[PDB]
Design a protein around this ligand. Structure first.
Ligand SMILES: Nc1ncnc2c1ncn2[C@@H]1O[C@H](COP(=O)(O)OP(=O)(O)OP(O)(O)=S)[C@@H](O)[C@H]1O
Lengths: 218, 479
């Protein structure tokens, strides 16, 4: 936390120390996760060099978790929301474990909420256009068998269809069945689909989301 | 002589410590270097436009084009950043901005970026349509493509792509972004102007993919190679997107043309509950303070399929419509006073257009409001054109405020068949016929010639013909 980016010449060995004492189910993960968060805040952009070595363990935490209420999964999810644009080349083997977390009907409800919210918040720095079919269907499955995860799943869906332009117009009749079956009203999803079906402009539809994020950051 | 006379002009780049004059003032040593760089660039990009220079610089021997690529593969951040400008202006490509992030320099090379020629005073719509809309020729030779293909083949033969990859990986970020953009532009030009045999193995990029997939090299090179591949894919997506209408008149023109082409050859209900909820959260009826309304909700309550003031006879909806009408009227001096470059200026215009079309969607219940709005617009236009003796000069407000978008409302109103009837009920077409005659205001003719619709025969073509035959020479030229 004190040396921001000068820890690089001694960072690799640090990872070598974390891969040795990160056993699966003990009280040592609660501090390893905080160490990961602090390393992420320190490196800030160069973390992608040392992210792969910590990817297996994370996966073994997502499936082999026997914590009361799945609180280690929640801490790991809150630690993942800090990665930002670092998990750009590694979103392919780290997203499926999270999409498998909120569509499982036996997982605790707060863990599913945490997964939905981290998927919702990870779209403010990443391009989620390619991984559209892997997210649209688990969400419409979470919407018809979970009467309490409706609002958070709708927020995630609205944040996802904001990046997709007219590329989402093919899914509208598929989601509308579930939306009218349970009388699901969301005010931002209605806005987005109204601007998708009926045109708003021509330059605003089918736009790179990173371009929009950059032009709104300035 | 063979290899010592003509190849001198590229000595400032190939020689890292180049001294042109034996005795020069020691005070000016960097300005002299920049002048040498500029002159050598102007000579190098001038020998590649002639055949006697192309052939003599790309000879199969120890030519002067291989010495130009070889010094590009040397980590010298002064020669390497100056050779990229020569490569950029050799292929007639636009230069990106000097940044370190790819997503900011990719936006500066957008074929549809705003230009100074597209302003109302300069080139309002005709100059803008030239850039974004493509030429009508699909089989003309276009000798420029021939020349560019020859130059690109000559450069690829001597190993330019490998040098660009080496510049992309082993260099700074300021130069990595510019080399990635140049590589993307060259890869796009390849699959467009090169024959299939010349460009069927270029998209593999072996030297970059073998680096992005090798786990023996240091991890920094692998990660920057993967990032370069991702940026190349992003550039390809940007290229296959296309240029989009920057302005709001050309947008409506293209949309109307596409709609005509679609309809020449062949959703939620929200009965009473969701309509009222969306009308409530919009905040229009809670308070009448403008600029604090929720304009997204207004747009979606105006654009929803079956909400047309003709099947939902609710007093709250009529209050909503009357408040929006009083806001949009120019006499109220509420919308017509906001200046251009406003924070939310395009959205207000889009909402106004879809609102004056929603009023038209009710052919039996939307007269009292639409007639009032268009009559107020005609009043404002006759006052600002010079048909009154008060001032007869109001160009200081039309050119700098959102009151110039009242031509877009008449434009989106003249497309529909029931729209032109309402437009003729009031003295709109006669007003434009009278406006065509004046000589002092030329911007109003630009505005009225690029807003109306000429799809069907009627009074809309008579105004166009009157401007084309009897008008000011500059207005006639723009028409
Ligand atoms: N900035 C404004 N935007 C909209 N309306 C305004 C604005 N400023 C004043 N008004 C007044 O509000 C009127 C529209 O309100 P109405 O449609 O009559 O609904 P209303 O709630 O009955 O209005 P009042 O004031 O209560 S009678 C405008 O025509 C003006 O009389």
């Amino acid at each position: 936390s004190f040396v921001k980016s000068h820890i690089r010449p001694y960072m690799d060995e640090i990872v070598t120390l974390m891969r040795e004492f990160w056993v699966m189910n003990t009280s040592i993960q609660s501090t390893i996760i905080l160490l990961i968060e602090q390393i992420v805040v320190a490196l800030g952009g160069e973390f992608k060099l040392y992210l792969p070595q910590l990817i297996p363990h994370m996966l073994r935490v997502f499936m082999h978790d026997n914590s009361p209420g799945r609180i280690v999964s929640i801490k790991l999810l809150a630690a993942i929301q800090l990665f930002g644009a670092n998990l750009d080349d590694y979103l392919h083997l780290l997203l499926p474990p999270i999409v498998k977390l909120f569509d499982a009907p036996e997982a605790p409800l707060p863990s599913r909420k945490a997964a939905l919210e981290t998927v919702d918040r990870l779209t403010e720095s990443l391009d989620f256009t390619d991984y559209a079919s892997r997210i649209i269907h688990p969400i419409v499955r979470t919407l018809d068998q979970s009467p309490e995860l409706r609002s958070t799943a709708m927020d995630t869906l609205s944040s996802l269809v904001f990046q997709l332009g007219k590329k989402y117009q093919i899914f509208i009749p598929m989601v509308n069945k579930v939306l009218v079956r349970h009388r699901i009203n969301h005010q931002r999803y209605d806005v987005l689909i109204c601007r998708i079906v009926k045109g708003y402009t021509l330059a605003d539809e089918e736009e790179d989301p990173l371009i929009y994020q950059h032009r709104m950051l300035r | 002589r063979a290899d010592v006379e003509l190849e001198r002009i590229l000595a400032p780049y190939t020689d890292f410590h180049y001294r042109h004059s034996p005795d020069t003032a020691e005070g000016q040593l960097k300005e002299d270097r920049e002048a040498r760089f500029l002159a050598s660039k102007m000579g190098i990009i001038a020998t590649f436009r002639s055949w006697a220079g192309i052939i003599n610089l790309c000879k199969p021997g120890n030519s002067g084009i291989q010495s130009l690529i070889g010094v590009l593969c040397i980590p010298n951040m002064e020669i390497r950043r100056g050779l990229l400008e020569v490569l950029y202006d050799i292929f007639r490509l636009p230069l990106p901005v000097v940044t370190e992030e790819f997503i900011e320099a990719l936006l500066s090379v957008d074929p549809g970026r705003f230009q100074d020629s597209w302003r109302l005073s300069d080139g309002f719509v005709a100059a803008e349509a030239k850039t974004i809309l493509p030429h009508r020729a699909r089989s003309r030779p276009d000798l420029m493509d021939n020349y560019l293909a020859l130059i690109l083949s000559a450069f690829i033969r001597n190993g330019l792509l490998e040098g660009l990859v080496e510049v992309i990986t082993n260099s700074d970020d300021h130069i990595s972004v510019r080399a990635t953009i140049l590589l993307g532009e060259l890869l796009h030009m390849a699959n467009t102007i090169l024959p299939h045999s010349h460009s069927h193995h270029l998209h593999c990029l072996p030297t970059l993919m073998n680096m992005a997939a090798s786990f023996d090299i240091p991890k920094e090179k692998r990660l920057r190679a993967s990032a370069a591949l991702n940026c190349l894919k992003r550039f390809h997506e940007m290229k296959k997107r296309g240029p989009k209408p920057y302005s709001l008149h050309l947008d409506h023109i293209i949309q109307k043309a596409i709609a005509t082409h679609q309809k020449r050859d062949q959703i939620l209900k929200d009965t009473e509950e969701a309509l009222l909820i969306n009308l409530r959260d919009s905040q229009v009826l809670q308070h009448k303070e403008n600029l604090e309304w929720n304009w997204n909700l207004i747009g979606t309550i105006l654009k929803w399929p079956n909400v047309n003031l003709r099947n939902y006879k609710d007093e709250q909806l009529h209050r909503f419509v009357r408040r929006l009408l009083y806001f949009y009227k120019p006499s109220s001096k509420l919308y017509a006073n906001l200046d251009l470059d406003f924070a939310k200026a395009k959205q207000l215009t889009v909402v106004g257009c879809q609102f004056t079309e929603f009023l038209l969607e009710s052919e039996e219940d939307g007269q009292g409001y639409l007639e009032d709005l268009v009559k107020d617009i005609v009043q404002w236009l006759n006052a600002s054109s010079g048909m009154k003796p008060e001032r007869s000069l109001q160009n200081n407000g039309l050119l700098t405020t959102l009151s110039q978008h009242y031509f877009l409302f008449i434009g989106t109103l003249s497309c529909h068949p029931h729209g032109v009837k309402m437009l003729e009920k009031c003295s709109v077409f006669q007003c434009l016929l009278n406006l065509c005659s004046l000589k002092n205001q030329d911007h109003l003719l630009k505005l009225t010639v690029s807003s109306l619709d000429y799809s069907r025969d009627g009074l809309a073509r008579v105004i166009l013909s009157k401007i084309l035959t009897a008008a000011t020479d500059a207005c006639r030229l723009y028409a």
